[PDB]
Amino acid sequence: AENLWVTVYYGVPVWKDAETTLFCASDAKAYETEKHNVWATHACVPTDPNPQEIHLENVTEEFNMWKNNMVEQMHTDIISLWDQSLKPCVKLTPLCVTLQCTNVTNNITDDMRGELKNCSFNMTTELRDKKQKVYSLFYRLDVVQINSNKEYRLINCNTSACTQACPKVSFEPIPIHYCAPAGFAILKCKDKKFNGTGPCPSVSTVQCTHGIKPVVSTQLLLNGSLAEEEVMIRSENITNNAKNILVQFNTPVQINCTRPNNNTRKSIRIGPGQAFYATGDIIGDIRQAHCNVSKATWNETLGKVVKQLRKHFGNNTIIRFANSSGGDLEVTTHSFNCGGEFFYCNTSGLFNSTWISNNDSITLPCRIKQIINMWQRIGQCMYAPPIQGVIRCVSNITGLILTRDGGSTNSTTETFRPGGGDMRDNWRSELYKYKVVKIEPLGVAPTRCKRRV
Amino acid sequence: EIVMTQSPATLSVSPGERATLSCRASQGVSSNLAWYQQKPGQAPRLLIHGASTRATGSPARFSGSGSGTEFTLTISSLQSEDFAVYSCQQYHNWPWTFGQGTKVEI
Amino acid sequence: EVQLVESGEGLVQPGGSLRLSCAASGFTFSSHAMHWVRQAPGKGLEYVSAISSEGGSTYYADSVRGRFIISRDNSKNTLYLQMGSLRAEDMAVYYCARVTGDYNWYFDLWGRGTLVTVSS
Amino acid sequence: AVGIGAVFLGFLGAAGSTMGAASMTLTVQARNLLSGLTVWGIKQLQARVLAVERYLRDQQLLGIWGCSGKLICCTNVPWNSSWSNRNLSEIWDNMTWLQWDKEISNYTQIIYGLLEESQNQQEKNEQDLLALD
Amino acid sequence: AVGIGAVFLGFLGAAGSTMGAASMTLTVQARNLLSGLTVWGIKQLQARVLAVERYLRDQQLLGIWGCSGKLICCTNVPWNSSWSNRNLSEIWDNMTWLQWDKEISNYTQIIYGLLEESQNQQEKNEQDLLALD
Amino acid sequence: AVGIGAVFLGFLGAAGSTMGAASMTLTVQARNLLSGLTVWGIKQLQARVLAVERYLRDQQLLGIWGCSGKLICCTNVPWNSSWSNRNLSEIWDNMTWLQWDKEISNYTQIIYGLLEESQNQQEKNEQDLLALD
Ligand SMILES: *[C@@H]1O[C@H](CO)[C@@H](O[C@@H]2O[C@H](CO)[C@@H](O[C@@H]3O[C@H](CO[C@H]4O[C@H](CO)[C@@H](O)[C@H](O)[C@@H]4O)[C@@H](O)[C@H](O[C@H]4O[C@H](CO)[C@@H](O)[C@H](O)[C@@H]4O[C@H]4O[C@H](CO)[C@@H](O)[C@H](O)[C@@H]4O)[C@@H]3O)[C@H](O)[C@H]2NC(C)=O)[C@H](O)[C@H]1NC(C)=O
Ligand SMILES: *[C@@H]1O[C@H](CO)[C@@H](O[C@@H]2O[C@H](CO)[C@@H](O[C@@H]3O[C@H](CO[C@H]4O[C@H](CO)[C@@H](O)[C@H](O)[C@@H]4O)[C@@H](O)[C@H](O[C@H]4O[C@H](CO)[C@@H](O)[C@H](O)[C@@H]4O)[C@@H]3O)[C@H](O)[C@H]2NC(C)=O)[C@H](O)[C@H]1NC(C)=O
Ligand SMILES: *[C@@H]1O[C@H](CO)[C@@H](O[C@@H]2O[C@H](CO)[C@@H](O[C@@H]3O[C@H](CO)[C@@H](O)[C@H](O)[C@@H]3O)[C@H](O)[C@H]2NC(C)=O)[C@H](O)[C@H]1NC(C)=O
Ligand SMILES: *[C@@H]1O[C@H](CO)[C@@H](O[C@@H]2O[C@H](CO)[C@@H](O)[C@H](O)[C@H]2NC(C)=O)[C@H](O)[C@H]1NC(C)=O
Ligand SMILES: *[C@@H]1O[C@H](CO)[C@@H](O[C@@H]2O[C@H](CO)[C@@H](O)[C@H](O)[C@H]2NC(C)=O)[C@H](O)[C@H]1NC(C)=O
Ligand SMILES: *[C@@H]1O[C@H](CO)[C@@H](O[C@@H]2O[C@H](CO)[C@@H](O)[C@H](O)[C@H]2NC(C)=O)[C@H](O)[C@H]1NC(C)=O
Ligand SMILES: *[C@@H]1O[C@H](CO)[C@@H](O[C@@H]2O[C@H](CO)[C@@H](O)[C@H](O)[C@H]2NC(C)=O)[C@H](O)[C@H]1NC(C)=O
Ligand SMILES: *[C@@H]1O[C@H](CO)[C@@H](O[C@@H]2O[C@H](CO)[C@@H](O)[C@H](O)[C@H]2NC(C)=O)[C@H](O)[C@H]1NC(C)=O
Ligand SMILES: *[C@@H]1O[C@H](CO)[C@@H](O[C@@H]2O[C@H](CO)[C@@H](O)[C@H](O)[C@H]2NC(C)=O)[C@H](O)[C@H]1NC(C)=O
Ligand SMILES: *[C@@H]1O[C@H](CO)[C@@H](O[C@@H]2O[C@H](CO)[C@@H](O)[C@H](O)[C@H]2NC(C)=O)[C@H](O)[C@H]1NC(C)=O
Ligand SMILES: *[C@@H]1O[C@H](CO)[C@@H](O[C@@H]2O[C@H](CO)[C@@H](O)[C@H](O)[C@H]2NC(C)=O)[C@H](O)[C@H]1NC(C)=O
Ligand SMILES: *[C@@H]1O[C@H](CO)[C@@H](O[C@@H]2O[C@H](CO)[C@@H](O)[C@H](O)[C@H]2NC(C)=O)[C@H](O)[C@H]1NC(C)=O
Ligand SMILES: *[C@@H]1O[C@H](CO)[C@@H](O[C@@H]2O[C@H](CO)[C@@H](O)[C@H](O)[C@H]2NC(C)=O)[C@H](O)[C@H]1NC(C)=O
Ligand SMILES: *[C@@H]1O[C@H](CO)[C@@H](O[C@@H]2O[C@H](CO)[C@@H](O)[C@H](O)[C@H]2NC(C)=O)[C@H](O)[C@H]1NC(C)=O
Ligand SMILES: *[C@@H]1O[C@H](CO)[C@@H](O[C@@H]2O[C@H](CO)[C@@H](O)[C@H](O)[C@H]2NC(C)=O)[C@H](O)[C@H]1NC(C)=O
Ligand SMILES: *[C@@H]1O[C@H](CO)[C@@H](O)[C@H](O)[C@H]1NC(C)=O
Ligand SMILES: *[C@@H]1O[C@H](CO)[C@@H](O)[C@H](O)[C@H]1NC(C)=O
Ligand SMILES: *[C@@H]1O[C@H](CO)[C@@H](O)[C@H](O)[C@H]1NC(C)=O
Ligand SMILES: *[C@@H]1O[C@H](CO)[C@@H](O)[C@H](O)[C@H]1NC(C)=O
Ligand SMILES: *[C@@H]1O[C@H](CO)[C@@H](O)[C@H](O)[C@H]1NC(C)=O
Ligand SMILES: *[C@@H]1O[C@H](CO)[C@@H](O)[C@H](O)[C@H]1NC(C)=O
Ligand SMILES: *[C@@H]1O[C@H](CO)[C@@H](O)[C@H](O)[C@H]1NC(C)=O
Ligand SMILES: *[C@@H]1O[C@H](CO)[C@@H](O)[C@H](O)[C@H]1NC(C)=O
Ligand SMILES: *[C@@H]1O[C@H](CO)[C@@H](O)[C@H](O)[C@H]1NC(C)=O
């Protein structure tokens, strides 16, 4: 067996890491009307009703959750869809005008004092010659005084012009599946104790990921996926305090949010075939918006998180939780979108505790806004039309985003505070078990066969 | 791991009339489904394979149908010898999985 | 008449070892793949391990990987299952099923079944 | 028939098996290498174009080595022990294609070059022989 | 020369003739299967990509059956009477390909599967034979 | 090895050499025929599509002549002196492919049809011969 020769094999199972462009695939049920959705699943290919998955025995692979190129592509696609859904909508250039505002003091509690303003202004009409005098209600977070009934202006007038969101389109998230082209593949890690980095001893290959809902929020991961066995803590470098920590819950925690104001909508014609939806009067009483969580359920979940955090810091260290340090409203509060409106809740009653080495509810006051700056961009804003009637939504808390404070030496105390901001960490919490590889179906090996002349 | 749910847990039907069993799949398994019968103390037997084809040698009264994630088994007539446990198995995604098993009582 | 019979039952202490055999007769044994399946008392059927026709590929379940070894002997038409480091949860009746065809993965012929018990 | 009597078959299903056992399922991976103005306007077109180009590039190489339309093709180039001195038993029964790829990744271009010239010589000699008649 | 002495030839010209007569003009249909940002921007590109993809998909099947680079290829798979029990004279002299396709449309996948495994076995045996020498 | 001992090799390197000498470097040109919304958006895509189409169109012709997967293929069509009466020595030792193309550019289409019909006849005869057995 010394007269060995080269033999060529086509179609061998080997692969290499690669970066390519994936394409979406939405469910067929999404085609039943409901074309009014920001996530334009109209152009998404229908999914396979029966997905196929192959188990890869004896195969060990290396994953790096913090250098995944799938995350970068998802961010760009989400931003592009957001921008594209706003092109055929009204542009509110003429709304940049001096306003004459006064406080709304009519059946209000002591906490809603100075939060609503009643402004009136001149507006253009469908005819280019004449103008109209109108009025509307604005939140105190969208108006800035310029120098009784002092005169204000919209906060964005000196940076850009807002685009009104088309009232028919809906913001409800819809599951999306990412699929790879021919000649590529996606590997999935089935280990239940995977910590995001290192070798995964249980692997399998698929052609499309499971349905991922693009939910936007900060400080709290909503309507996500749950761990199978235990609370999972993941970080790029646990010993470095400049890196965020991701937490995945073992069980869900319910949160109830509502806006207890019966709002009214008005239509104002500002041009030929163009309308601006203002806020009329409020029918009834005026009260603050809030969110509810169960005190008992939250306490249990925090206890499990502490137990899994001591493994990286020792059994004889004090663990304490504190609220955010500072920054803009979008970073120091738990932001989210609940059926059209945009909330900014004060999560300072959640992170208030200290843990030693050894029925009721929590109410979080929230505010509301109408001028939205998404994706941390500058120069592009959006205007959210008012919603008529009362609002109520329910969802599950699935994880967290935390941050550690640099302490001198080992003071036996560690303090963690919530922190969000970058929206890539939201996608990273769902695509942590996937990677893209490239197939190489050509191999050469020695054998005893020889070509016949 | 696709999870097979079989309901009702226990079914009591007198001889002669209809008898229906349900097997629900947590994920679309197409038509790759089979039904098995096991008497107490005997070697289990194959009745339905492919969710629509009758196993060779089985009585014709047995009949099942369904595709996707909903499947059903029906027997034209219940005989004295039909008392047994019935389970559904899917062979779409490895590893193969079985249902909890529905008990039929005369 | 095609049929399979299992043997080797007995009493085994926790952490012990036990070997099972499933003799076959009435068909070409070296042309079909085999499986091992167990049913715990009060639970459903769960897959344990599998082996290819020629015995060149073996598959294991996660709970048994590293403790069980499966082998076959085409000459004597026999199937073997070697158990090591037994535990309490390994309580069931073990059936040696058979696979039919190269694209019909469902079983077509089961076995009588044998009962294995662990106690101190 | 029962074919080879396998537990199951699928794309890349034999990645963890020995090179001897994985060589009986080449068609499984071979048949899935071709198909198996909005935002998604070009994300669907460029991918298809790239897949076609890669497939054709792979096919051309087999074409110029004389192995067109084949899955296992024997050649006329002797194996050089410098590339690997391992036995024929510890290669086809104790290694997987993923491992083997790493070992000989350095010498791939040398072999690719040798095969081309071997085929060229064969073609020229065949033409001469036919011309003689 | 006068070739086969036909009244005329053209694409799909022999669609209404018997399967025996239509088999002498395969090249006529074979050669016309490849080429024979405004509104009209992508309506010209997607069509071309689709045509190329379909052509390659058809070629690959012939490739894996061992019939690459051929118009009429003989195989090693016996015919099963269950598919069709008709004589050899009433098929090649009393039927057209359009009618034939309807009859055996149900069993196409079975035949496609058999043809692949036959070629796999042939290739394996061919490799084994050369090693003995 | 030293191969053919050439001063240098490259794409179109032997354009000004005799047809005899240029025939030993066919692989050099063969391997470089496949890869060797902004303004630059479609200027990259249409070019790639066109290249793929041209390559496939060229390959199909070899396919239907029976010369698939070959660089030098012998045929069964005798040469007609009307096309060119020059000797065999003043063609392969005193002319270049560029000059030769001009001389016989008129009769290229005539030669192509004969190559197709010869292959058709060969396939039919082979099928009959195999059927006899
Ligand atoms: C985490 O996940 C949870 C659950 O998936 C999610 O909560 C769900 O949010 C959606 C989106 O808001 C809710 O769907 C809305 O529900 C309201 C209330 O209707 C409920 O009750 C009726 C009667 O019992 C049921 O028939 C109905 O199915 C609901 O259960 C609806 O009013 C909403 O419809 C309006 O909005 C749609 C989208 O904008 C429009 O397409 C639709 O036409 C409706 O608008 C029209 O009517 C309005 C009222 O007349 C009018 O004002 C409009 O101008 C227009 O004419 C919508 O169906 C769903 O109920 C929530 N689920 C639960 C259990 O509460 C969380 O939001 C999610 N978390 C995050 C952060 O996203
Ligand atoms: C995933 O990976 C695992 C482990 O790497 C694979 O499982 C192994 O598979 C190999 C075969 O590929 C098994 O090795 C074979 O074992 C047979 C059984 O005999 C064993 O027991 C006797 C008695 O104790 C020992 O003497 C003997 O050495 C074995 O330990 C042997 O009979 C086999 O030898 C035969 O074949 C070889 C090769 O042709 C010949 O050289 C021999 O002379 C003889 O004819 C062989 O040694 C191994 O036991 C398996 N391990 C386990 C733990 O099960 C999986 O197959 C793999 N899965 C996939 C999908 O790739
Ligand atoms: C909307 O447009 C109307 C009309 O252009 C504006 O009303 C005008 O406001 C100016 C500003 O004060 C008035 O000028 C002042 O008038 C008083 C009373 O005559 C006079 O004493 C002052 O010396 C000064 O000239 C102007 O008269 C008034 N016009 C009318 C018809 O009332 C209005 O301010 C604009 N804005 C809003 C919010 O309505
Ligand atoms: C109307 O509301 C304003 C607040 O928007 C009151 O003005 C004060 O504004 C300062 C600056 O934010 C606050 O710190 C004070 O608390 C506000 N109240 C007072 C009494 O100073 C204003 O008083 C309200 N009433 C009227 C008639 O304008
Ligand atoms: C906001 O101010 C407007 C006036 O600019 C109020 O609307 C008027 O209220 C008076 C007082 O009842 C009525 O007589 C008028 O008919 C209303 N309309 C107009 C055009 O003047 C409005 O009520 C105020 N809203 C709040 C919440 O205070
Ligand atoms: C647009 O106007 C806003 C409001 O005046 C500016 O934001 C303010 O900037 C000053 C800087 O001297 C701060 O003291 C204020 O606190 C800011 N206001 C708020 C509400 O944060 C903003 O800088 C202006 N933009 C441009 C481009 O001039
Ligand atoms: C996640 O687990 C991996 C191991 O699977 C950890 O990576 C190892 O970390 C140790 C030190 O803790 C190093 O000595 C090893 O070299 C690392 N191995 C690899 C492959 O990187 C990783 O630190 C864990 N991360 C967290 C956040 O727990
Ligand atoms: C993870 O973070 C720790 C702490 O920041 C890194 O350890 C530091 O490494 C720098 C070298 O650049 C030293 O100067 C510091 O003294 C180290 N600090 C400690 C506490 O050891 C560590 O290198 C980081 N891990 C990786 C892989 O970069
Ligand atoms: C919010 O206010 C609207 C408008 O007042 C209420 O809608 C009306 O409710 C009454 C109930 O007595 C009906 O008779 C009317 O037909 C409704 N439509 C109108 C007046 O246009 C709505 O019920 C209120 N929602 C609350 C209080 O939750
Ligand atoms: C959230 O919790 C608050 C209390 O923490 C609930 O407020 C109560 O609401 C009922 C119904 O309107 C009132 O009778 C009580 O007086 C309220 N409690 C107070 C004022 O302390 C609220 O209903 C809960 N639900 C939501 C959606 O916020
Ligand atoms: C959040 O709202 C949900 C409503 O869906 C509450 O669930 C209900 O809770 C009451 C308790 O008073 C039960 O009687 C109902 O049966 C529950 N409904 C359902 C559908 O389960 C939930 O308790 C609220 N949670 C918080 C923290 O406010
Ligand atoms: C975080 O919690 C603290 C304590 O509950 C809040 O209290 C303020 O803390 C800042 C410094 O952290 C002080 O300057 C203020 O005087 C404190 N009181 C008030 C009324 O602000 C703090 O505001 C909370 N921070 C956030 C962003 O919610
Ligand atoms: C978030 O909520 C906390 C608690 O309600 C706020 O901190 C309190 O602020 C009030 C004044 O608004 C003070 O009287 C309390 O003493 C503060 N709490 C403590 C423990 O000192 C906090 O300011 C809120 N965040 C904001 C407003 O951004
Ligand atoms: C957050 O924690 C602080 C500190 O425990 C709470 O503030 C008060 O703290 C004093 C002693 O430091 C206690 O005697 C009081 O009972 C605490 N407040 C109350 C209402 O009991 C604060 O209540 C906690 N909750 C927040 C900040 O929302
Ligand atoms: C939030 O969590 C709840 C509780 O886990 C989820 O409700 C479950 O939904 C599944 C799928 O429909 C059902 O099979 C379970 O029976 C539900 N649980 C209960 C107790 O009924 C809910 O789907 C999660 N998502 C939300 C609320 O959006
Ligand atoms: C929370 O739970 C812990 C133990 O799980 C208990 O000691 C504590 O009193 C509870 N309440 C708070 C506010 O931490
Ligand atoms: C084998 O390769 C080595 C270096 O890789 C070289 O020195 C030797 O000459 C080669 N032998 C051959 C090709 O026979
Ligand atoms: C390779 O073959 C030699 C000679 O038979 C033997 O001594 C050696 O052990 C073998 N090595 C293997 C099989 O790894
Ligand atoms: C022919 O097909 C029938 C069913 O279509 C099948 O029962 C029979 O076994 C087949 N015979 C063969 C393949 O020889
Ligand atoms: C088929 O052949 C048989 C036997 O020669 C003959 O009896 C029958 O008529 C033929 N059927 C045709 C030609 O349709
Ligand atoms: C093909 O099968 C279908 C059922 O799937 C049947 O209706 C049809 O008649 C069959 N065609 C032929 C020619 O037998
Ligand atoms: C050669 O070509 C000439 C015209 O080009 C023609 O007259 C003659 O018949 C041909 N001879 C052949 C094809 O043998
Ligand atoms: C062609 O060959 C003939 C006969 O050998 C000779 O007379 C003539 O000179 C040759 N012409 C060339 C080589 O150009
Ligand atoms: C080819 O034919 C054209 C006329 O169609 C003629 O002008 C030219 O000279 C011919 N070329 C040769 C090389 O005979």
Author numbering:
A (entry chain I): 31 to 141, 150 to 185, 187 to 309, 312 to 321, 321A, 322 to 398, 411 to 505
B (entry chain L): 1 to 106
C (entry chain H): 1 to 52, 52A, 53 to 82, 82A, 82B, 82C, 83 to 100, 100A, ...
D (entry chain F), E (entry chain B), F (entry chain A): 512 to 547, 568 to 664
From the paper:
The HIV-1 envelope (Env) trimer is protected by multiple mechanisms of humoral evasion, including conformational masking, glycan shielding, and sequence variation. Here, we analyze B cells from a phase I clinical trial (VRC 018) assessing a prefusion-stabilized Env trimer from strain BG505, fixed with an additional disulfide (201C–433C) to comprise DS-SOSIP, which stays in a prefusion-closed conformation even in the presence of human CD4.20,21 We sorted B cells with stabilized trimers with their bases covered with glycans and sequenced and expressed constituent antibodies, for which we assessed binding and neutralization. To investigate elicitation of HIV-1 neutralizing antibodies in humans, here, we analyze B cells from a phase I clinical trial of the “DS-SOSIP”-stabilized envelope trimer from strain BG505, identifying two antibodies, N751-2C06.01 and N751-2C09.01 (named for donor-lineage.clone), that neutralize the autologous tier-2 strain, BG505. Though derived from distinct lineages, these antibodies form a reproducible antibody class that targets the HIV-1 fusion peptide.
To understand the differences and similarities between antibodies 2C06 and 2C09, we determined the cryo-EM structure of 2C09 in complex with BG505 DS-SOSIP. 2C09 binding to the envelope trimer did not induce noticeable asymmetry, and we obtained a 3D-reconstruction map at 2.81 Å with C3 symmetry from 445,733 particles. Like 2C06, 2C09 bound at the fusion-peptide site of vulnerability, with 90% overlap of the two epitopes. The fusion peptide in the 2C09 bound complex also formed a U-shape conformation, except for its two N-terminal residues (512 and 513), which turned back to interact with antibody. As a result, fusion-peptide binding to 2C09 involved residues 512–520 interacting almost exclusively with heavy-chain CDRs, with ~470 Å2 of BSA. 2C09 interacted more extensively than 2C06 with the N-terminal residues of fusion peptide, providing an explanation for the stronger observed binding to shorter peptides by 2C09 versus 2C06. The CDR H3 of 2C09 was four residues shorter than that of 2C06 and, unlike in the 2C06-Env complex, did not reach the neighboring gp41; this difference accounted for most of the difference in total BSA. As such, the 2C09 epitope did not include residues G644 and E648, two of the high-entropy residues recognized by 2C06 on the neighboring protomer, but did include residues H85 and E87. The 2C09 epitope also recognized the S241 glycan hole, in a manner similar to that of 2C06.
